Model the fold of this input.
Amino acid sequence: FPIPLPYCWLCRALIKRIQAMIPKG
Done:
């Protein structure tokens, strides 16, 4: 369900999921 809610803890969980899909070196 893609819902854009402005919350700091939800933004930190989305940044950790993007880093787990694309590896940094």
Remarks:
- Residues 1-25 form one domain.
- The two ends are 31 Å apart (CA to CA).
- The CA atoms of residues 8 and 14 lie 10 Å apart.
